[PDB]
Write a protein that binds this ligand. Sequence first.
Ligand SMILES: CCCCCCCCCCCCCC(=O)SCCNC(=O)CCNC(=O)[C@H](O)C(C)(C)COP(=O)(O)OP(=O)(O)OC[C@H]1O[C@@H](n2cnc3c(N)ncnc32)[C@H](O)[C@@H]1OP(=O)(O)O
Ligand SMILES: Cc1nn(C)c(C)c1NS(=O)(=O)c1ccc(NCCN2CCN(C)CC2)nc1
Length: 411
Amino acid sequence: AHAFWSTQPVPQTEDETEKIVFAGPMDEPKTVADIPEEPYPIASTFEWWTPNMEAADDIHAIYELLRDNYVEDDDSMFRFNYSEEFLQWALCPPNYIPDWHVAVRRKADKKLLAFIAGVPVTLRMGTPKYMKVKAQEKGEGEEAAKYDEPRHICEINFLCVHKQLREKRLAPILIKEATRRVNRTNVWQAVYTAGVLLPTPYASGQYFHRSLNPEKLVEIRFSGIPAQYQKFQNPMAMLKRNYQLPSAPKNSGLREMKPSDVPQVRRILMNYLDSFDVGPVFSDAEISHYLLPRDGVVFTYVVENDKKVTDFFSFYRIPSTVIGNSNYNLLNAAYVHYYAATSIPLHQLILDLLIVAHSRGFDVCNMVEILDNRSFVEQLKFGAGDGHLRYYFYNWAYPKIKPSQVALVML
Ligand SMILES: CCCCCCCCCCCCCC(=O)SCCNC(=O)CCNC(=O)[C@H](O)C(C)(C)COP(=O)(O)OP(=O)(O)OC[C@H]1O[C@@H](n2cnc3c(N)ncnc32)[C@H](O)[C@@H]1OP(=O)(O)O
Ligand SMILES: Cc1nn(C)c(C)c1NS(=O)(=O)c1ccc(NCCN2CCN(C)CC2)nc1
């Protein structure tokens, strides 16, 4: 029973999703003119607010709402503490639409109560390869290729309702209003991820974690000491030793990315991403925005052996408030972002990622089993966590695919 999701243009059950063969819209074509010009109705103690994303104070207000009310684990140990600079970066990519950032405020005192954000993404979302092959056996290639062109769509993130306003059906209202503002700009599909199960994922993958500071992670109970370590005289010394890393990167040529790297980086990234069924298409402007280093937010390194860039890796920072332990304020996580390797094995590229993230004081390295992330798990000592990232479309019928056919990283 989903009183809201049952009303929406999404597949309704797993069985429906495993029955789908081609990519395409769920809904009837609609027009910009068809869409209400007036904001969705909301109780008169509240108003809609469109925050200004290049205004430091508005960023601050969104920052605080998320700090106190955004994602926690189920045991209330950690809550995301995305920084202000991270939010400006995430919410203001090139050609972003200010209207797509949707907030609810109390009319009386302008207190922020809820938020949802949309940003533009150019995404390949045509029929996956194996379904195309089948359609070609059967003379249905035309139907299977109809939506192969990259689509300019919306990416949803940062949905948050204040803790005091939970389970008052406010999330559906935020989602309806976001949908309206995006539809008004002639966009009819969206992509979103969630740690929770909703109708209905097109792909789902486990989270993986690479301990960088194991003693801190045990202390805060992000991690436990596995039971075989108890046969050691000093469990923690064995644990520290098991996860230890060099201080200096191993690849010669490794340096930080710079603006003149953009075209080379774009080329090797796009060549690599194009091999997945679902992936973003990036302009020079978007490579520069999503990958150029920004202090405390995104860290990007290239391999340049012979004034020629042949590999790169990137990671981003999300700290979490450590809610139940007084000895630490923040767990500092580094998230594996985009990468491409043409001159060295991927496990060797990513070892340097761990080395850099460790030397910069990160506690853990996190990723989902999308891209070729499975390919270096065992050797680099990542372990699976209890979490899953699920990938969804809005108003797009899509076959169930494996997470290793997904090339879209979500922030
Ligand atoms: C064309 C463009 C279209 C754009 C729109 C695309 C669709 C985008 C969809 C959004 C993608 C966001 C991606 C991310 O940001 S995922 C991260 C979501 N944020 C958090 O988890 C932060 C902490 N939690 C909260 O702030 C609240 O619990 C939220 C706001 C999540 C729910 O508020 P509350 O707990 O006060 O509940 P309600 O009484 O208001 O509403 C209950 C309804 O909400 C459905 N629900 C619960 N969680 C989610 C969820 N994560 N995505 C979609 N729907 C969700 C739920 O099944 C139920 O519907 P139904 O089962 O009765 O049918
Ligand atoms: C360290 C930490 N902080 N927080 C808030 C959590 C849940 C953790 N633990 S964790 O193992 O790193 C982890 C576990 C599960 C998880 N789930 C995905 C939540 N979604 C992340 C991506 N986003 C676009 C939608 C929300 N993300 C992170």
